[PDB]
Amino acid sequence: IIGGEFTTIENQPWFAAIYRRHRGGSVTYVCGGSLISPCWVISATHCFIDYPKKEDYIVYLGRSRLNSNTQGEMKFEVENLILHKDYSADTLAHHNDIALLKIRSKEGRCAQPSRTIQTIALPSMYNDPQFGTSCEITGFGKEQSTDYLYPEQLKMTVVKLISHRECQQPHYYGSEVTTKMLCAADPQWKTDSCQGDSGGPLVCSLQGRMTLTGIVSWGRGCALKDKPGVYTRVSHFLPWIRSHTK
């Protein structure tokens, strides 16, 4: 996250921190995710494309920090790693960039809600809020696009939904953005999601309820003018989600 603020897991209790085990024993951060039900976390396919082995991953919930332990955190393994069959990408844009991970503890249990862990609601089919709406994004991603390191503390910021007709503009993304994606950006372009934030939530208030409207996918650079954040559009994937979580 560029700009925005530091926060704790309690302010985003659905955020899932996803790491990969490295052969030879080292573990590194891969991507964020969101807890949509007790046993299921939703994220972005491109996070996992180069290493599709479910055994390679660990999912933490209730975790406020990247490389140090948060009290109340719960650790899981991936029982099922579902990547979207229609995933494709360019140098820039990613399509059908959505994934599910089914989590189970070694003890065999799905997540249990607490102070630090809550599920997030899915939207209703094809139901997104109007352009102009302020949503929030959360991640362990770079604080600036040139950084070598990720912050150690979780961050969030606020961005406003942009129009497709508008994200369509040549100055913006043109052809690259489809109806399976949503765009969001700061009006002055000062805050945005950056590498490391992918898989993470775009959360908007829809019908008096915090709702998972998007998944962090791609953008050109991080917080660059005329180049908004692009997000997988959850409301247009419910059938995929329901089918694959049945």
Ligand X SMILES: N=C(N)NCCC[C@@H](C=O)NC(=O)CNC(=O)[C@H]1C=CC(=O)N1
The residues binding ligand X (CB under 6 A) are: 92, 94, 192-195, 197-198, 216, 218-222, 229
Residue number of the CB atom closest to ligand X: 219
CB of 219 to ligand X, least distance (A): 2
Phi, psi of 9 (to 5 degrees): -60, -30
Catalytic residue among 34, 64, 97, 186: 97
Q: Which is nearer to ligand X, 123 or 229 (CB)?
A: 229
Q: Which is nearer to ligand X, 102 or 227 (CB)?
A: 227
d(C-alpha 190, C-alpha 134), whole Å: 15
Q: Which is nearer to ligand X, 172 or 218 (CB)?
A: 218
| Contacts with 131 (C-beta within 8 Å, 6 or more apart), sequence order | 160, 161, 162, 163, 166
Please say if 97 is a catalytic residue.
yes
Catalytic residue among 43, 46, 56, 217: 46
CB of 213 to ligand X, least distance (A): 15
The helix (H) or strand (E) run that includes residue 242 is helix 238-244
Cα dihedral across residues 139, 89, 133, 123: positive or negative: negative
| CB-CB neighbours of 55 under 10 Å | 10
**DSSP designation for 21:** E
CB of 221 to ligand X, least distance (A): 5
Q: Which is nearer to ligand X, 16 or 117 (CB)?
A: 16
Residue (of 101, 109, 64, 105) closest to 84 by Cα position: 101
Please say if 46 is a catalytic residue.
yes
d(C-alpha 168, C-alpha 186), whole Å: 17
CB of 62 to ligand X, least distance (A): 22
Catalytic residues, by residue number, are: 46, 97, 198
